[PDB]
Amino acid sequence: SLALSLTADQMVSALLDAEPPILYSEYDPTRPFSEASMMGLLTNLADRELVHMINWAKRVPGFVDLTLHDQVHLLECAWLEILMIGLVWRSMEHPGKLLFAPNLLLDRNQGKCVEGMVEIFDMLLATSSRFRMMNLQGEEFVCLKSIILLNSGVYTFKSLEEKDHIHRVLDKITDTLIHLMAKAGLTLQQQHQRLAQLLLILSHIRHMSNKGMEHLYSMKCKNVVPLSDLLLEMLDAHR
Amino acid sequence: NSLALSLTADQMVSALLDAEPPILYSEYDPTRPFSEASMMGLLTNLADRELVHMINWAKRVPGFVDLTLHDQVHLLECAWLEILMIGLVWRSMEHPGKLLFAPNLLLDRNQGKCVEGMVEIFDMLLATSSRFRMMNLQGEEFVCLKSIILLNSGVYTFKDHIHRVLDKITDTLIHLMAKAGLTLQQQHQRLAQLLLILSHIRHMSNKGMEHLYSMKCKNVVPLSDLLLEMLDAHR
Amino acid sequence: HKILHRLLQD
Amino acid sequence: HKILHRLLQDS
Ligand SMILES: O=S(=O)(Oc1ccccc1)c1ccc(-c2ccc(O)cc2)c(-c2ccc(O)cc2)c1
Ligand SMILES: O=S(=O)(Oc1ccccc1)c1ccc(-c2ccc(O)cc2)c(-c2ccc(O)cc2)c1
């Protein structure tokens, strides 16, 4: 395997070079908002982000070593977690707003246009504000996003050697995060604490995804917002 | 100022160990064959009684009493199923392939199929228990993880106090790993492994909460007022 | 009122 | 058969 031979610095540069681009929305400022229109813009946006996410996942160290069936399952379980942490990341410098796209910046007042969507909006905001207080770095973010990809579906799959390889890569990413924090001047006590703080946030990202996933069920059944063929397939993988 | 922060690592461990709730028993009827109604009857009765012990355990968690009553209610509401699940997983460690709900109630996955959707969460619980087994999770580590869940799961749905306690527990976890002889690299690797399992415990609780809400909607078994109130504020 | 309130104060 | 399995498989 190549991923296991990589140094921490090589891991970071590989992860940074594989960053997907920040796509634009079809949002028209002159046009007025409806629950169907806003969710349609978000659904159109996420459906395009998924294509880049799929090709970004191929670039994550160790991901191609996995069987194809495990690649499907990892992405099927983690796709909304990854969309959400990317959303939260690019929203750091915008307090009280979620930057879904450079042309789609929303506050929680506009998130109330969708029923029940206000509660998850506040959690994303709190997560984004939390990244601000921590001064989260881009090198730490790409580690966290890769951890989600490999971790969120590993305990829900007789060759169990697939999980050992995943845990070895996960351990390598932990080594990477620590290496980054040590360069920033943090003491060993500060390194462990920050490391714990970062990974605890992933627990909240799992919670937001689960909640968001069940909200996407309702819109599917409600049928007011059409869902793309790819998102429908990613959806019923959870339900 | 909170007393929990002035505690040392060993003082933290002892306080958590001393506050461990007891392992309760299910009803003593020998009918090992189960139906959907008798399965959920035994579990809801067991979990109701565990909840009373959890609430008194929570008050003993260093730093938890320093919070307002409203903040305490919020954390327990958000974390209770997670805490039940990590307790179940913990005491199921030495029984691979089975879940020890009580000493007199040890179930395998074939019995999980009695209730719709139980088997999916059952397997996740078994997977978590085997994961703990392969890691050789110690009881001192377990009580730290459980208190982390209590203070973390609801912290972002509300401030520096809880985060100062969370750092303290992290310090305690590392302190425990340093005593057991782990190197520096093994310390932060194991810390990360333990905390990532918390993401899956959160996942299992979310899916578990969805199904307890359907059992409420299905009226398969009468639910207690306390359980119904815990089910609320999750919808 | 919540039962949980009563149980925490006891 | 899935779109996801297809996109992953493309070379
Ligand atoms: O279930 S939510 O909580 O509901 C809302 C709706 C509006 C405002 C706030 C919350 C939520 C939140 C975020 C997203 C989303 C969309 C794009 C993206 O890149 C990241 C997240 C999405 C999302 C994800 C995928 C979709 O196809 C459509 C929407 C949903
Ligand atoms: O969501 S489960 O997977 O099972 C299903 C599945 C479908 C429909 C209804 C329930 C699950 C698993 C574990 C528990 C439980 C109970 C006690 C305990 O100490 C730990 C876990 C519980 C639990 C928790 C609280 C209760 O009042 C009753 C049961 C539930």
- The topology under which CATH files domain A1-239 is Retinoid X Receptor (1.10.565)
User: CA B195, CA B199: separation in Å to the nearest integer?
Assistant: 7
- The topology under which CATH files domain B1-235 is Retinoid X Receptor (1.10.565)
CA B193 to chain centre: 17
Q: Which single residue is written with the structure tokens 């005593």?
A: B179
Number of residues assigned to chain B = 235
Q: Does A58 touch chain D (CB under 8 A)?
A: yes
**DSSP single-letter state for residue A105:** E
Structure tokens at A230: 């790819």
Single out the residue of A72, A128, A75, C7 nearest to residue B225, CA to CA. C7
Amino acid at residue number A17? D
Q: Does A191 touch chain B (CB under 8 A)?
A: yes
Cα-Cα-Cα-Cα dihedral sign, residues B85, B87, B90, B95 = negative
Q: How far is the CA of B90 from the centre of ligand 2 (A)?
A: 15
User: CA B126, CA B116: separation in Å to the nearest integer?
Assistant: 17
Within B86-230, strands assigned E span: 98-102, 105-108
Q: Is the CB of B43 under 6 A from ligand 2?
A: yes
User: CA A54, CA A208: separation in Å to the nearest integer?
Assistant: 21
Method of elucidation: X-ray
Please list, residue by residue across A22-48, b when 16 or more beta carbons sit within 10 angstroms of its beta carbon and e when fewer do: ebebebeeeeeeebebbbbbbbbbbbe
**DSSP single-letter state for residue A3:** G
In units of Å, what resolution does this entry have? Answer: 2.2
From chain D residues 1-11, the ones with a CB under 8 A of any chain A CB are 2-5, 7-9
Task: Give the chains touching C; criterion: ≥3 Cβ pairs < 8 Å.
Answer: B
**Which residues of chain C lie closer than 8 angstroms to B77, CB-CB?**
4
Q: What's the number of CA atoms in the CB half-sphere (13 Å) around residue B43?
A: 26
Q: How far is the CA of B227 from the centre of ligand 1 (A)?
A: 31
User: CA B28, CA B40: separation in Å to the nearest integer?
Assistant: 15
Cα-Cα-Cα-Cα dihedral sign, residues B32, B36, B37, B42 = positive
Q: How far is CA B64 from CA B16, B55, B148, B172, in A?
A: 12, 11, 11, 17
Residue A18: burial class (beta carbons within 10 Å; 0-12, 13-18, 19+): middle
Phi/psi of residue B78, each to 5°? -75, -35
Phi/psi of residue B130, each to 5°? -60, -35
Structure tokens at B39: 């399965």
Domain spans in chain B, listed from the N-terminal domain onward? 1-235
Single out the residue of A160, A67, A177, A110 nearest to residue B192, CA to CA. A177
Known binder of ligand: residue B131?
no
Determine the 3-state secondary structure of A236 from DSSP. Answer: helix
- Beta-carbon separation of D8 and A234 below 8 A: no
Determine the 3-state secondary structure of B106 from DSSP. Answer: strand
Known binder of ligand: residue B94?
no
What contacts B197, CB < 8 A, 6 or more positions away?
A155, B128, B131, B132, B145
Residue A216: burial class (beta carbons within 10 Å; 0-12, 13-18, 19+): buried
User: CA A71, CA D6: separation in Å to the nearest integer?
Assistant: 11
Q: How far is CA B170 from CA A93, A157, A221, B165, in A?
A: 29, 30, 43, 9
Is residue A62 within 8 Å of residue A169, measured between CB atoms?
A: yes
Quick count: other Cβ atoms within 10 Å of Cβ A65?
A: 16
Single out the residue of B100, B101, B102, B98 nearest to residue B110, CA to CA. B98
Structure tokens at B10: 């060993």
Phi/psi of residue A186, each to 5°? -70, 140
Q: Is the CB of B223 under 6 A from ligand 2?
A: no
User: CA A100, CA A102: separation in Å to the nearest integer?
Assistant: 7
Amino acid at residue number B38? S
Q: How far is the CA of A89 from the centre of ligand 1 (A)?
A: 14
User: CA B208, CA B27: separation in Å to the nearest integer?
Assistant: 23
Determine which helix (DSSP H) or strand (DSSP E) holds A109, and give its type and residue range.
helix A108-111
Q: Which single residue is written with the structure tokens 């793309």?
A: A228
Structure tokens at A168: 């070895």
Is residue B228 within 8 Å of residue B216, measured between CB atoms?
A: yes
Known binder of ligand: residue B91?
yes
